[PDB]
């Protein structure tokens, strides 16, 4: 039930900021900032997300387990990748190309990972 939930979340929902002519969805598990159906990370059975590590280096990747639904305690598996600028970029690409696992938004995840690595470099 992805479209049924999107017809409720597309408006009248929290996390949404549209003060200017552009709107932003701002979910804890989301790659881009656009409030769209193909990029929402709360309504699908399979979701990929990247995030800067809490220690100060590396990238954490959150994947929707899909094994047990409606159980947000273990619904997300979190891994940590701390490698050079290319090994992480290749591992994240394999994580979406080898498995089917939502083949789209692969470029979105890769771009976000590269952008957060650019900020982790200094």
């Amino acid at each position: 039930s992805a479209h049924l939930q999107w017809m409720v979340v597309r408006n009248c929902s929290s996390f949404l900021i549209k003060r200017n002519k552009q709107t932003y969805s701002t979910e804890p598990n989301n790659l881009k900032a656009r409030n769209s159906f193909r990029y929402n990370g709360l309504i699908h059975r399979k979701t990929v997300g990247v995030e800067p590590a809490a220690d100060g280096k590396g990238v954490v990747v959150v994947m929707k387990r899909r094994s047990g639904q409606r159980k947000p305690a273990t619904s997300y598996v979190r891994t940590t990748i701390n490698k050079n600028a290319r090994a992480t970029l290749s591992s994240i690409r394999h994580m979406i190309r080898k498995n089917k696992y939502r083949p789209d938004l692969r470029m979105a995840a890769i771009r976000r990972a590269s952008a957060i690595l650019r900020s982790q470099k200094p």
Partner: protein, 62 residues
């Protein structure tokens, strides 16, 4: 030139109701009537935009 009093088609192209299930039905039947090239799909998509009056309740004996 030509008068512009009848240039705008008054027919509706979007359901005024906010029912989510009706919206999903419209989103599905629009794709069907656009792709399958079926006049039945076209007419059943057109009949979903209609209001409460234009969709009369058909009885069982009829």
């Amino acid at each position: 030139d030509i008068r512009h009093n009848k240039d705008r088609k008054v027919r509706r192209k979007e359901p005024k109701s906010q029912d989510i299930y009706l919206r999903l039905l419209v989103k599905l039947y629009r794709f069907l009537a656009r792709r399958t090239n079926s006049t039945f799909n076209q007419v059943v998509l057109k009949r979903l935009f209609m209001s409460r009056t234009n969709r009369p309740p058909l009885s069982l004996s009829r």
